[PDB]
Symmetry: C6
Subunit: 213 residues, 6 copies
């Protein structure tokens, strides 16, 4: 990464590979990825993705997404040809941002320029976009099917609900609505009755303490 440049740390790299081995594509993999790639160059970012053995269906989807974002980038930032002046960098293309048509030193040039052409953070955006698609698609459950069982402690139901929620394809307002409707609606008869009695203004803290017994 950049803090000029240093090599991606072996411990960071192995951390990233361990995460993908164990967790597959659970939601928490994405903040984990962001943390391990803070200040990363496109090179470092490619290193991280390429280091993954297996899950090549997902890694291929991630390439396709990256190439979409690259094409969009080109479309919005059309190249202006000419001799690049002394003390200046060329305008990065879609592929320069994703690291396949740029050198490390060009990447360092962009990231440390005044003002910066922040290509790592652009590429990280695109990567995370692709990671989000995969997480969603690889989620086994649907939020509409999370139903508290007759003798299931409320806390375990809430744990399943919000896990499934975190992997859903939905904006914040749509998630807010799933909480407004489904959580209470899909509780078991006893808890459901008690939570209806608390009203629709009640906090999760309130609801959980209410169905403790």
């Amino acid at each position: 990464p950049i803090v000029v440049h240093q090599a991606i740390s072996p411990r960071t790299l192995n951390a990233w590979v361990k995460v993908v081995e164990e967790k597959a594509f659970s939601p928490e993999v994405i903040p984990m990825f962001s943390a391990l790639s803070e200040g990363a160059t496109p090179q470092d970012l490619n290193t991280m993705l390429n280091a993954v053995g297996g899950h090549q269906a997902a890694m291929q989807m991630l390439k396709e997404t990256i190439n979409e974002e690259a094409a969009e980038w080109d479309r919005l930032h059309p190249v202006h040809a000419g001799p690049i002046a002394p003390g200046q960098m060329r305008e990065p293309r879609g592929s320069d941002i994703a690291g396949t048509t740029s050198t490390l030193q060009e990447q360092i040039g962009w990231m440390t320029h005044n003002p910066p052409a922040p290509v790592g953070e652009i590429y990280k955006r695109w990567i995370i976009l692709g990671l989000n698609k995969i997480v969603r698609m690889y989620s086994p459950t649907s939020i509409l099917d999370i139903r508290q069982g007759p003798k299931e402690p409320f806390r375990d139901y809430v744990d399943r609900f919000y896990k499934t929620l975190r992997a859903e394809q939905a904006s914040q307002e749509v998630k807010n609505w799933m909480t407004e409707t489904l959580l209470v609606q899909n509780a078991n008869p006893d808890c459901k009755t008690i939570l209806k009695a608390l009203g629709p203004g009640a906090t999760l803290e309130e609801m959980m303490t209410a169905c403790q017994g």
Copy 2:
């Protein structure tokens, strides 16, 4: 964290994730969290919370608490609109402090300003507030139910008492009173008799050495 800024360390992060895997929400998780987040930016803080897979009931309660503290913040610090001058930062909102409507560079701007707008320490406060609620709620036992058994070594009873005490929803003065009343009151007849004989001025050292035999 800030010491300007560096990436949250992979070892720090994995430390934090390991703690939540093993300890769940035992009281000691909170000082552990403070230690691993010393100098953290809101981004780093979010990284740490988001890295947690599972316990999404608790992580959701923690969001709700954070949003309460954010609303309170807004209420007390009402926004003053206008063009921000050169060499100045905008006044942070509730959501800017919690990292969802601020960039990392805005966070770095606030934390390193003269005088600092110490947004990490504010957000850490709010997080720990939420962590304290969860610990309490997830405590299995009540302090009123800790009773020394007939053949239970006094030290093991004191160990259960003060563990349960540490997870209670009570100020220092209320805790002081639980010690004043319950510890001696809920000892077994033999130890109880011996500790009554020491009087109410006796130290824990004194009490433990007294019921050693």
Copy 3:
């Protein structure tokens, strides 16, 4: 490596040796190698290759490849004899680049000169060239033999396809064609029918969600 020079880290080195123990010569070994050798001197690079115990058939092929690239280098950069002036370095030969006829201090001299004679990155190129040959040759499967099974979840077939693809001796355009033809062509009758119905413009995301059920 160079960041002047420091010793290759013991953790980096053991990382590299662990990778070759576990993964043998799976495709992901090569980005792993690049990451662990960022800024490496030819010495450091030789250290990494020499540290490998076993796989001496492959390590011998890698030597042969290195010596080919060295001979090519000599051919294109013919030596110009004469006394090297003060404040100057000799032109590196093929073997100087590969570290067998150069000292560490000569390597440091080249890598830190203005402009640099970037001998580490040249030698890394040649090494990776040799690593790519070995990966291909040591691949057990051929892309033409990857056929989805009658009850095989489409995702597992796509996982086998793109794993085998990544180890193939083929340019990007030839890979693009294997995707254009073989993926859909070698699916099982049910999925094959559904993917034919999507047409040849369909994304992998689209194709996978289509054959989910």
Copy 4:
């Protein structure tokens, strides 16, 4: 710690928690604590104590001891009220030293002042005082009960003797006397006879080599 200030390291912290898990309160825990807390702020010190889950009987005794030392401190250093001048720090109270009524920045202010108000080393003193009480109290054996067995190799007896000795509540002169009297006195008849014959000027080296056979 301070070396200005950096966060307590995650490895240091986990080291400390591991020590208390494994060793409980064996004597060697205290030098271990001193090592892991070199240059610590009161905050760092509290972090270390608070990180301990379990042993809350002992952790409570340690609080009581800390509060005693704090009260003594107040008694000897009575507060002098007034506006603190520019370029000056307030006189630390007992609780400021123990970190509960001081900020980290006040602690850093004291520890880095010219001359320093060395609050970490004061609090560490008090902590170690409390740790010493606990070790003693939690020692299972008494030095008066360590008796060499009939077929016990002298070296194993000396190992038990000096282990039990290290956990005793006794000054150096009292320990010197336990060595003068008990070691030889409580040896088995054969070794006891041989060590009486060496006289009271003999070194431990001499005594051990004497009872080797």
Copy 5:
């Protein structure tokens, strides 16, 4: 090591001790040794050798070799007596290079002088010379006895051949000849026939792909 001087790292040291525990004296131990001792002082080097428990037959041979190289050094660099001037170092003897009659500060003096008396790299040379003798002597197999078995995959034969080759006492030209003669000559009848048909100009890549089936 020197990068002035720092202590040999505990991780480096334990790395070195682990290598000798596991690998004994396989060829790869020597590049491993060079890597872990980059910039080492004679002291550091002695530390590494002395840290080895066991294999004292080999460690004794290594001493004998070191003392030979030391005697040779003395012979070629005969001592010139006299008062050493201010701003000057004495000429190092054989034993000064090997660290037994020099202080660390004398070693640092030599290694950092302008021009350097590079005593670490001299002693490392001598050590590696001794390590090479041991590897050879401790090799179980002879290159003349490596014969492909009737149903042995060619790749496994080539793996045994080049492993045994790497431990041989032979210059490059002699190794080149063992490849020219023995590899093909000692293949099984089927592979042997196919490799004879490729001719004596064929690469290892070519030969291995030829005997794949």
Copy 6:
């Protein structure tokens, strides 16, 4: 240690404690100790010794030895009383060197003075002196009892011989003589005959290759 001062590293410390757990007092423990204590203050040194749980017979012998060396030090360096001038340090006593009557800052004062009063290296000397006594005394075997068995590979006999040799109480010249006499003298009849035939000028390399078959 000093490189001014930093805290002994947790990894160094745990390294040292692990060594004493596993190896007990095998000869290699002493170079291990020197490595882990390079640049150590007396405080750091005491930390390392005090961190050892168990082996208190040996740790007590080590104290006795330290106190002997301290008394000798006092004897040779008799204290000269008077007011210590500005810009000066008091002359260290035996106990100041061993860290029990000196502060860390006094130790840092001595070690960094121009010229240095190198108290760490003095105390390390004394410690290693004591460690050497213990190793010798705790050695199970005597060099006079190492006899090659009738079917024992010569290399294993040489391994036992030089291990036992390394733990002996003997100068270099006395060790040289044990090699001159005992090694060949205590070989089995077959090897003994062959080594007599090589003569008394033969190297260990020569002797081992001679008794290979």
